[model samples]
Target: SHMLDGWVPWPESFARRYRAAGYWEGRPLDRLLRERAAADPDRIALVDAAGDRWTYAELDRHADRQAAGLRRLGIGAGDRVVVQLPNTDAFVVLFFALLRAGAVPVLTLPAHRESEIVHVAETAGATAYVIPDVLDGFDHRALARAARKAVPSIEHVLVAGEAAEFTALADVDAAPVPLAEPDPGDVALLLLSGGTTGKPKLIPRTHDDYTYNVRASAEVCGFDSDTVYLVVLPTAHNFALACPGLLGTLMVGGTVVLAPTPSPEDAFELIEREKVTATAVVPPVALLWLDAVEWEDADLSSLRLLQVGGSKLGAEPAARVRPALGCTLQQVFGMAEGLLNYTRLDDPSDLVIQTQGRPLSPDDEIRVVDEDGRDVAPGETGELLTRGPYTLRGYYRAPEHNARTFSDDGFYRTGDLVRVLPSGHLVVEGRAKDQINRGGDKISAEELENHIMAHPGVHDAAVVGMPDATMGERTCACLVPRAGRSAPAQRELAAFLTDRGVAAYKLPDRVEVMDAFPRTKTDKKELGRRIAGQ
Candidate 1:
């Protein structure tokens, strides 16, 4: 690979120790909001999916009224309100409204069906659920009804639809008077993990925690009023809300263009039409947009930065799309639990390609530890753990999961296998639990999926460890075939892997062809459930 000029490389020894001190000293979320509201009350703070814009003053007033309305409806501090709405202005309205009322706002992905929705709501002890009338092809009213029936704790259904029992959000206008602001340390958001290999888990994000995370991400993403972003990712996810979409927009006083679904074609048109200067997207979205730009011969001169996160991207996509999109390609590695990692805007091109960037906040403390709980030296692979002022302390009600995922002292175990490079940048290896062992020769599922997805016939793929007596765990591959075509036979895939020099032991012993793989709440691969039933 070619290298860029003026790249600054630091030793892993110094960088590892430097990030070990997770001591963030920052302002509370309420304080930050108050400062922004007071400073620019008339300035636009957010734009809804329908292109409706809200000024800082309008957002503040709406939140105040909604807070009072929630209080009147018997919702108070410590109560949980599940938000299942699609990408819209209502999400932001309810998000701040719940915060102002000191109520915990649990974000449910639009992809979550009844089972996941019921599970999350019941686990959170949520009584009130706010859902959209309809979105895409999904009937939300029916789903909400199923959720209500599945979870007995739910007493209120705040639907955006017309139902006798469901209350209209418009009816609950900002009260004539304002309500009191919540404590900075109060739990404000309940963000769920993106379950790439298993079920998504709940994460409790305090106002103090997420606020700082958003600010840190904004710094890494280089937000400014000059930057115009598209909010196509689900707002429930941390990256969409924190980075260039919402929080970043607030930080820079920039404009956010919201589209119901963020497809490559829609986004390309939007970027050109809206003159979007900077936008953050997921890896899948990046790949799609790049393809669209090439196919449609779209004019993409307005875009200056293409920030990709939520998942890693391949070198082919990154290097190939840069010339076509005419933007700087940056990759970020962050978890909702509070660790914000990314490639710095000023870093060399190789650093962006080979490594994820360092922490933006000085207070962030990231460390790599071996199996025995001792710290690993630089350039060694280990489990990544982090602890900082802005990070999550615990899950909502999952005590068992908390014990396994967090350390005794405070650090949150990211469960991601990684190694700190000699240059101090981190390279994510794979998930520790998601690795497949074929007679002790382990292979990363992510590696296999990445390789398979590169194939022209493969639209999406997932590799799982099938129970095998001889190999302990043999690889079982499942794939979604491309449109209007049957899946490639198992023998053909084996030949393909063998031709690519994929290890014999790592090759799938059994291949399952399907129209579509099961997806988790956040639309990530649901490997566990899919493999279990098969």
Candidate 2:
């Protein structure tokens, strides 16, 4: 069986080519931590919400103990564990522990509840689930129980904090055990896709490719032992986990500070206390932080660089970063599937504010093509296609979907409409995927449409993204009621979706009861234009 039972492996020729090209350096991701600990055993590695700190040596030793404890609990090589802990030092320790034990982690955000967890549990055949006792006042222990009851594959429920019946993560303190070395090509973890389809696909990132991406990110972002990075985004997010986030800080022996939430009140306090030099946030959070700095007159002088990504940051706000926060703003455009781009610190301010930066590696092949698959001229919007050292070749066990998602030449269709600037920077125009960019969270229209249709009074439904000043886009649902039945009110629909376990952000921000969808007799663009009107 494969390291992740259903994950697809890169073709042998491509693997050999990557290795020959020196991208696949035969090192696993966990090695980043091991080497750093040996070289700088006394360097501080992590600072968490409780003001607890850990040194490099202490982190590595804790990981080894956790790995040994996991082994005693019958989790070993090839096992899949669902990791759903919130922002905490335990999350960092447990992540490395799973990797060191040769087990694959299925990374999930702490916000995910029953609807998402059930799917991941069944799809990954997860053998264990790890969580925090509570986060943001939601009982993850309750979520764990619901998931365990839904999927029989889960053998244990491990909690970082106190729980009645769940396995206490603190108890996993067995002596370090000898761990079998995992192949560099083995799947390191499964990352969730920004959903386009009804359900999110699992992204399989391998040790060889993922480690290179993390190292290249750290180099591009200029991290060092002196770099004090603050992780304000959820630790499970790809941007926070490996796009020079925690993993990169650990790689260069930098200090990582974790915040319980990204609110300005919480993050600003941590940044000031830690003297944090670098941090990343989505555009919405960045705006919140900017406003907070002005209103609170917060002392953010310690911050040196602010990295913004996850969605387009408005030019007006982007231009304001340095003036407001006294730091250089770096635009990052990346995905869980592994293509990363960054604006260099030396780039012109206009370029930094206008375009998403260039790819980190020269080998990261990018293509902007029309719907017919012909290359589009530079500065003309087209669907983005890319194949590179870090980009995934396929989704886990999704042969049919993979056939449609990747080109015969191995380029993954990014589903983003973008134009390339003359300087090779990508300017994101919009998305072709059936999804909404709600405050940086990708809400799948198709998924919400399905849930909305579940209501008894709906006949047909369509969900579309409408422009919004703050959220970038808001979800609008257009519904056609049953012929003789009355349409449900927007409030009713919202409650129904929430009851069905849809995330709060995915609920329709606006609803329109339409007589019929205003579609053209021939022109397909008319339907999209009609939806925009609502």
Candidate 3:
């Protein structure tokens, strides 16, 4: 079983049931592309920002070549490789390349600095760190250098572009080599568990579950060979990749288009030029597109569906999407761990606008519970608990957190406060976790506070989540300086945290130098109220 021990595997009974129910077809995810290429060799499979197009055969051939190249770099079966790249052809090709090499790709974003990458690299005990030589004026080669130095497990540093001191990804290319096929149950990849609980946790996804995830999502979202899907969100993100995103679009033999940014400036032109049929974005980007369509001259007539999620899309803004953009609005509510809830394509107006829809799999078990763990009333709000074919029983290498995050019977504590309608749709209320949803970016106040506490200019730090109009919530870092020294200003503190390897969105939106800390729950509530009001 090439399955690692840290990740909790499904029980034999559960596995047998899932397999018998036809929910899990024992197939590796690499087959999603390999089979598609054989069936539709000449179909347009990928279109990059530079207008570079690759047919299914072309993409499959490239992956085969790259996979051999990766193996040549000493990254093969049972090896964990950190893959940090932007939304480009390299991202798509390298992803499948790692899978074909039988190496587990630990996907991280380009925004991840030294801290995030180093932590991810060490956590996975990765053998290689694949990164861009330079992206958006930021030098990732330097980040790769820093991460490799910190984690000796990462012996190979491969860069997509120019390789200053590292191995050139271009050089990794070689003739296709004979490779051993991986087990369907092997952990194919590691997705970042989206929560600010502390340093990031790894969510191990098997080929069987993730293949089911992408294929099922495509079926629900109506992706077909004629579908033209755009990648506006970070391509590495779970939402953009498999939430009927890239892999899903590709699974159905659809054309996958990559955009530099979700901004209307980059996305709208592609929507018109490429005739993009569907795309996914967060609440803030949805809002931006809703307004942009008003003045932007780009033709959006080809856009058939616009799916919004990552954070809650308020009823008001959710209603604006279908009317303003002239497309079906699919409200997606999901996490990296599993249990994707998506509004169906032909759902009624109210359900599409007001709810996050139902579970992806029919076997998905959901429970709403109160503070004492008792089940909440059918229509009432409480913490959402879910377990299903696609959802993980436990996070990779996180036994202690797993004990607290999942129930004895195995439902994952999602930390999301939600209610279920009679129609089986979910109405997201709020969150039970002390995390901030800043425009679809999940930030852990606890993690940010830990970073702020490390600052030499501060005696103590408290990070709070306050409501915001544009972003659902923004973070505030209230600090008390050393007895004589002044607390770091916004720029200085941001720079310090940046140096510490914090994601930009996790940096506090506002900083307050307080006279004293608010310790009581009542006082903390009052403080949050005060911060939000401002």
Candidate 4:
């Protein structure tokens, strides 16, 4: 039996009724410091990989210094400050600092090289780039130079390690400053969506807009003072910042154990050391923990809310998580644009793996719309459109994009295809743009890959659309076979899918064997980029 917490009931039908009554409401991301700081001045709010812990008071104080430092450099309200770094203490400090100074922080992944850095800079209209001096062999100074050439808007470059890149945060020259309380509607952070193509789209979530999402997620997950959260995801990402991250924990007065990155070995050590009671992690790290628990005993007894999502977890992840981690697994499904939904921790494990659960709060209205933009019947696949307090009503400076993204009634077109189940849960089929048109019948690349993953010899797989003369577009499967395993041929792959009840058109016309797929900073498959290169 599933366990329900807070206002949540185990049954999905009952929860939908409560959502209709407006059960979730929250303030902006940065507004949490005052209340959370006051509530626990000495409690640990953040920790680094090197074991430097920042309490709520200390974290707030550091943010004040960073905010004041930015103000001295002429960063103020309405300015966009770009951040590109791996998971680090400085990343968290600068992110909150930018928000506190009323300058919108544009978070970019570290895996992004020179080309992507420049693209995001221009797209966000960044006034300055806050970057690390040198990250893992790549020169930050050189990257910043390339970005400056690409975007005329970015003039200042602040480096984390290099003293010569205009400003060295290590010098500590700035005077102590206070957190500026901005208006609830002020643009606080520019959350970037990793679309299937081109440049990343900006989702400008204001102070009040994101507040509701995180708060509702906190309440839905049953966070409290007793909760010891082990953060394993990139803190800069919305999943880490919005739900089960700094913002969500602050909303519920939970303790945060920040790890620089999530590796299986590191995550296991931290869980035991910190006695982590709750944590939000993606599939890869969760899989590592699952394997570790099988070989050795993990003190996962304290862990309660183990939320997982961001990419396809597959059936293997679902099977190993609960028995291995010794905790309830929940699925958080939402975009950086907001309107968060999650599988309740108390729900049946099958529901968490098969469905995206339900909305965090009643305020988020989600509807599946067909090509004509009409609401589709329940169980029918369509584009997911949503509008709520937290969802961005418009993109930053992208007026042209806003016209294309939002519907007539103002619901933000999520651009992803999904189905609304009778239980009011969202089941993601695949991306609308990522779907290939095969003789007018659409085939989801994700569906093809999910089916391929079930094979024992296959480790991971990605299906992409390939241009075809006769069929418009044919499916191509990029597969990475398991260690010492023989590669499956195109015929075997086709037969495998055919036996699994996959449509004949959805089967791959071509197969590409690779040791690894191009990956993002967060380890998400860069299928679009890989497909373009091929």
Number of the top lDDT candidate: 3
Candidate 2 residue 241 C-alpha distance from true site, Å: 0.8
- Put down candidate 1 lDDT per residue, 413-458, tens digits, no spaces: 8777888876567887755556675543445677677666666678
Itemize residue pairs with steric clashes in candidate 3. 196-444
Kindly give the stretch of ten consecutive residues in candidate 1 with the minimal lDDT sum.
Answer: 1-10
**Whole-model lDDT, candidate 2?**
0.87
- RMSD (CA, Å), each prediction: 12.0, 1.9, 1.4, 12.1
* Alpha-carbon runs more than 4 Å astray in model 2: 519-534
TM-score of 4: 0.75
lDDT per residue for candidate 3 within 243-317, as digits (tens), equals: 999999889999999999888989999999999999999999998888898899999999999989988888898
lDDT values, one for every candidate: 0.68, 0.87, 0.89, 0.70
TM, every model: 0.75, 0.96, 0.98, 0.75
At residue 340, give the lDDT of candidate 2: 91
